[PDB]
Design an enzyme around this catalytic site. Structure first.
Site, short mmCIF file in Angstrom:
data_model
loop_
_atom_site.label_atom_id
_atom_site.label_comp_id
_atom_site.label_asym_id
_atom_site.label_seq_id
_atom_site.Cartn_x
_atom_site.Cartn_y
_atom_site.Cartn_z
N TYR A 92 0.47 5.37 -5.29
CA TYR A 92 -0.53 5.97 -4.44
C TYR A 92 0.07 6.96 -3.42
O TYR A 92 -0.66 7.45 -2.57
CB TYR A 92 -1.35 4.93 -3.65
CG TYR A 92 -1.92 3.73 -4.37
CD1 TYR A 92 -1.43 2.46 -4.10
CD2 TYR A 92 -3.01 3.84 -5.23
CE1 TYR A 92 -1.96 1.33 -4.70
CE2 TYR A 92 -3.55 2.71 -5.84
CZ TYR A 92 -3.03 1.45 -5.57
OH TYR A 92 -3.53 0.32 -6.15
N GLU A 94 -4.52 -5.46 -8.51
CA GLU A 94 -5.06 -4.59 -7.48
C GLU A 94 -6.05 -5.33 -6.59
O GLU A 94 -6.93 -6.04 -7.10
CB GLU A 94 -5.85 -3.46 -8.13
CG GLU A 94 -6.16 -2.30 -7.22
CD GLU A 94 -6.39 -1.00 -7.97
OE1 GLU A 94 -7.36 -0.92 -8.74
OE2 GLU A 94 -5.60 -0.06 -7.79
N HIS A 125 0.85 -1.18 0.00
CA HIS A 125 0.00 0.00 0.00
C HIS A 125 0.89 1.24 0.00
O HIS A 125 1.87 1.29 0.76
CB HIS A 125 -0.99 -0.12 1.17
CG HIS A 125 -1.66 1.17 1.50
ND1 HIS A 125 -2.63 1.73 0.68
CD2 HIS A 125 -1.46 2.03 2.53
CE1 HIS A 125 -3.01 2.88 1.20
NE2 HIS A 125 -2.29 3.11 2.33
#
Length: 506
Positions: A50, A133, A21
């Protein structure tokens, strides 16, 4: 049934299921909701995407990557499509409540869990990517344990350097950006102290002149600088390709000087937004014919140093800035970012350049619908649709500023979360705003370039708020407008535009 929407070839139960993450700045000082879902991925390098500051997405600080592990058993349930209505239908769920809330229920876990404590959904990450994902329920995500993979805010690393050098491990262009930054300063000072360069500078008009006069002078500056012994490597490369010629180099520096005003100069994000939509960056970055030619720390530093000094020279001639300071500060910082972006693309496998329908060619770009069906926007149902467009360019890196999309109030809205562009598998999300009630402009959250060997899938996702059909007289837009580079003609700004026409159907 289940079978129309679950890919059983990619579904299984694991103990201690783990994924990566990307975390935003400040986080590294478990998992908690700030996105209606927690995203993770099997690919630690894509997770890094991200991680950039949502407030300054092009240029701001990256946070980090963590590895997150669920204790006990987790069912990975791979999906064959990402359409929430289809999924809810064929898994026989509630057609009303959100998919991810239902995925978190006792009943869903019993039905699809195969004895696991929770279910995570799996989808393909992007066109051009072999990553996965994972979509996670927030409440379920509180059970995750978290381990640091990398912190990009590590002291001593300057720009987005730590993020791009980390990502370069995936690969190959693997440059030391600390060395480049040090060497760039060194080369600037050498050029400034050089007798011929001092002589050339004193020949500058050093006041507003014609673009033609500026270019002539800057071309000479370029040639003089290339004869410095400390630019011998850049001199050699420059002669191997017409893209790298002084005239093209001069043209970049003029265009820079023309678009940077003082408000822009004093902000790195604004500077990066402005530079990222200019044509002709391949002349300075040494990119042509599908290869990175400026491929060592020495050549890179020499070109950044020279472009810095050339921007400094151009500003009095064609610019509006009182200071030259931009050239040494935000110009260098921003261009380094652009180099890193393009290197990152060239380090990845080229997404197929093969247009599947006849492409539209303009200004060096080519665009096409992936399929006939992609070019059709269906109407008269509630819910989502997705539409893929292939983007290539013939040679040097050409930017994609963004995309203009049609909207009709309560009948056709852009799904701002699912709409993205994938560049050689790098998935770049969008920030979208209404120009008015009829048109939304979506801009990539990282700079997008295409060129020979760097190709993209643009994925446009629409949501329909109601089941009424779009009327013929409601259609303002015939097309999706892909926006390329910005050219300054007289003093006015024109975007390259490539239009793909769609049809509204029931």
């Amino acid at each position: 049934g289940a079978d129309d929407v679950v890919d059983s070839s990619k579904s299984f139960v694991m103990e201690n299921f783990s994924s990566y993450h990307g975390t935003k700045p400040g986080y590294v000082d478990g998992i908690q909701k700030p996105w209606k879902e927690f995203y993770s991925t099997d690919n630690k390098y894509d997770a890094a995407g991200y991680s950039v500051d949502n407030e300054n997405p092009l240029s701001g600080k990256a946070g980090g990557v963590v590895k997150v592990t669920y204790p006990g058993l987790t069912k990975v349930l791979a999906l064959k499509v990402d359409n929430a209505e289809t999924i809810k239908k064929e898994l026989g769920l509630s057609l009303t409540e959100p998919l991810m809330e239902q995925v978190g229920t006792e009943e869903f876990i019993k039905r699809f869990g195969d004895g696991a404590s929770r279910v995570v959904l799996s989808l393909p990450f992007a066109e051009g990517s072999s990553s996965v994902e994972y979509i996670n329920n927030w409440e379920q995500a509180k059970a995750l344990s978290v381990e640091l993979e990398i912190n990009f805010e590590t002291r001593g690393k300057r720009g987005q350097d730590a993020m791009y050098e980390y990502m370069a491990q995936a690969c190959c262009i693997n440059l030391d950006w600390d060395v480049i930054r040090d060497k760039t300063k060194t080369k600037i000072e050498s050029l400034k102290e050089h007798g011929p360069i001092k002589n050339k500078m004193s020949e500058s008009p050093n006041k507003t002149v014609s673009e033609e006069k500026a270019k002539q002078y800057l071309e000479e500056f370029h040639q003089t600088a290339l004869e410095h012994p400390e630019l011998s490597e850049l001199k050699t490369v420059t002669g191997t390709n017409p893209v790298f010629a002084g005239a093209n180099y001069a043209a970049w520096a003029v265009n820079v000087a023309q678009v940077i005003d003082s408000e822009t100069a004093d902000n790195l994000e604004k500077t990066t937004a402005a530079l990222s939509i200019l044509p002709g960056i391949g002349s300075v970055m040494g990119i042509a014919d599908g290869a990175v030619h400026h491929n060592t720390e020495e050549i890179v530093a020499q070109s950044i140093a020279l472009s810095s000094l050339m921007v400094a020279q151009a500003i009095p001639l064609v610019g509006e800035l009182v200071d030259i300071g931009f050239a040494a500060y935000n110009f260098v910082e921003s261009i380094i970012n652009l180099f890193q972006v393009v290197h990152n693309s060239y380090n990845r496998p080229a997404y197929s350049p093969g247009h599947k329908t006849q492409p539209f060619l303009h200004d060096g770009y080519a665009v096409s619908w992936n399929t006939v069906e992609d070019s059709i926007i269906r109407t008269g149902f509630q819910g989502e649709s997705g539409h893929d467009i292939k983007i290539t360019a013939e040679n040097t890196p050409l930017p994609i500023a963004g995309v203009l999309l049609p909207t009709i109030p309560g009948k056709l809205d852009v799904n701002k979360s699912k709409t993205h562009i994938s560049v050689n598998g790098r998935k770049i999300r969008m920030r979208c705003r209404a120009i008015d009630g009829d048109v939304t402009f979506c801009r990539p959250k990282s700079p997008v370039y295409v060129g020979n060997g760097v190709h993209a899938n643009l994925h446009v996702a629409f949501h329909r708020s109601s089941s009424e059909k779009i009327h013929s007289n409601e259609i303002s837009s015939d097309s999706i407008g892909v926006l390329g580079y910005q050219k300054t003609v007289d003093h006015t700004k024109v975007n390259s535009k490539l239009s793909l026409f769609f049809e509204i159907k029931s």
